[PDB]
Design an enzyme around this catalytic site. Structure first.
Site, mmCIF file in Angstrom:
data_model
loop_
_atom_site.group_PDB
_atom_site.id
_atom_site.type_symbol
_atom_site.label_atom_id
_atom_site.label_comp_id
_atom_site.label_asym_id
_atom_site.label_seq_id
_atom_site.Cartn_x
_atom_site.Cartn_y
_atom_site.Cartn_z
ATOM 1 N N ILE A 132 -53.925 40.640 -29.639
ATOM 2 C CA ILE A 132 -54.730 40.788 -28.868
ATOM 3 C C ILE A 132 -55.788 41.595 -28.638
ATOM 4 C CG2 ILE A 132 -54.290 38.715 -27.205
ATOM 5 C CD1 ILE A 132 -53.272 41.023 -25.224
ATOM 6 N N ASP A 180 -67.554 53.568 -15.860
ATOM 7 C CA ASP A 180 -68.244 52.173 -17.064
ATOM 8 C C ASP A 180 -68.240 51.176 -16.696
ATOM 9 O OD1 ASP A 180 -68.630 51.242 -19.625
ATOM 10 O OD2 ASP A 180 -67.507 50.908 -20.408
#
Lengths: 310, 313
Positions: free
Chosen positions: A11, A122
């Site tokens: 993934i 972030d």
């Protein structure tokens, strides 16, 4: 496979996996140490330690650490519900009552880190993950599953629209008030399914950011627009702390008696009888369970233990 | 393979973009589909301004516009499809390009941007995700006019890949206006072609900014010296001291193995509108002679002109 884990599919190299003895799913970051320089290796293990110290229900947990000569496996919480960004794409905006549910979790999580003098720097919707219950699991707080270590071509997908104005003015981008602006932006995308500040390129986006004006939709309550005013303030020193913002009306609607507060780290979970037992009758000794969980070893024994809590 | 619009069968989505097949030629195109009702007068003028720009660029290395289909509620822009994908995705898959291969693509890239500079059009957002590849590995720059990424302030744009190529101006609050901006971005692009990585990195925009503002980047051991000197003409921190692309075209590395064929600005070829070969195929499609004549002479961007262009492939 590696350890008590069966790699399923993939993934930044990340694998879905099944802890064999609990049947629980887990994310397994795989990292090649030979491809790392000392400066980067240090930052890694430094961030691994940060992950071992953040014990909060909305910050993806770390379960085990396997380290070989050339390799470092990091077994961590998997969030079956994907990104908040992807959700918002499909189902569009959330209902005021829905957002609050998660935005509480978020602000509680970020606030927790500000306590320890960790600013995320972030924060974005792509970094907010969800589990099978629609609970929030913030990622990239410590070690980053999105940023390779200087080798690859990072795209910084989704980062610009949440950047505080300091970034475009050359001013320092250090203090907690930076995550604070981003939270504002986050909240706005939750109750609108769109961006307060947008553009065709980075130039246009900057222009709109530094001006600080942003449309409030008709369907947005008046208690909400008032929460945004507390986040999206242009001057960093006038943006309020998160402790001060948990005390907002919009934040506590539906919690008249349950007012949000700076999370308190729960006491070390390490002696649960139900799981100590379940483990013994798998083939674990009593004191290796004791030593492992006392020293917070983060080994195959501590992993199994933590995975039994789901 | 179901809906049709004009001469186009829409095959699949690739913002709303569809890969379609033009039924008369069997050639592939990309159709951008714009809901006009969702736009406001200010924006509508930006759309048509940009589409006018699109009609006006005629370069071998900039994605071409073929047809404009306009209805009451919708606008369809029919443009070249680059089957070879992004240069970005290509670098991720194949690693760096050896210098010889890079010069070939970089040459096409410089011609295209310089062409737009002559007309005082600056891209403002060159990145490896905008450098498309066709079936022959030729470069097709996208988004010089209208942006197949920028959905008009509506959705949740991600800006993928933009930050690492931004000139230092951006992070300093200075004017991000002129061609010099593109030139810096070109500097980043060159470097990522030949090393397969970015010159300025970092785990978040804060860290990216430091590297960008400082202006220091490592030259790999395998990077030619000529290449290093070429980067030195792009990656200059001060906007005004950055070269123009016209001057940069004269560089040594730019022209290795191009001794008698030095890179110089692109000159627009003579118009195409009379090919009797293609004129004949079209006549036996049901098009009339003077309707072909009107549309081609007039550069209409209707179904006639589009069919004519696509017969050129």
């Amino acid at each position: 496979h590696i350890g008590n884990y069966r790699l399923l599919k993939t993934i930044a190299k990340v694998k879905l996996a099944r802890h064999i003895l609990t049947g629980k799913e887990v994310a397994v970051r795989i990292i090649d140490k030979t491809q790392l320089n000392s400066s980067s290796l240090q930052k890694l293990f430094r961030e691994v330690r940060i992950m071992k110290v953040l014990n909060h229900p909305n910050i993806v947990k770390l379960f085990e650490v396997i380290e070989t000569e050339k390799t470092l496996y990091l077994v961590m919480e998997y969030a079956s519900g994907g990104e908040v960004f992807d959700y918002l794409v499909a189902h569009g905006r959330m209902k005021e009552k829905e957002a609050r549910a998660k935005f509480r979790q978020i602000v509680s999580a970020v606030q927790y880190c500000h306590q320890k003098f960790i600013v995320h720097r972030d924060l974005k919707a792509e970094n907010l993950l969800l589990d099978a219950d629609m609970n929030i699991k913030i990622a990239d707080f410590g070690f980053s599953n999105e940023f390779t270590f200087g080798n690859k071509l990072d795209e910084f997908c989704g980062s610009p629209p949440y950047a505080a104005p300091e970034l475009f003015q050359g001013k320092k981008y250090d203090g907690p008030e930076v995550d604070v602006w981003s939270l504002g932006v986050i909240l706005y995308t939750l109750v609108s399914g769109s961006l307060p500040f947008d553009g065709q390129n980075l130039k246009e986006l900057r222009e709109r950011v530094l001006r600080g004006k942003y449309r409030i939709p008709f369907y947005m309550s008046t208690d909400c627009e008032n929460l945004l005013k507390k986040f999206l303030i242009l001057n960093p020193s006038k943006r309020g702390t998160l402790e001060q913002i948990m005390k907002d009306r919009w934040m506590n609607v539906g919690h008249e008696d349950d007012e949000l507060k700076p999370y308190v780290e729960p006491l070390p979970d390490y002696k649960d009888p139900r799981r100590t037992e379940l483990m013994v009758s798998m083939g674990y000794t009593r004191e290796e369970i004791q030593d492992s969980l006392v020293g917070q070893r983060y080994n195959e024994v501590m992993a199994t233990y933590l995975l039994l809590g789901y």
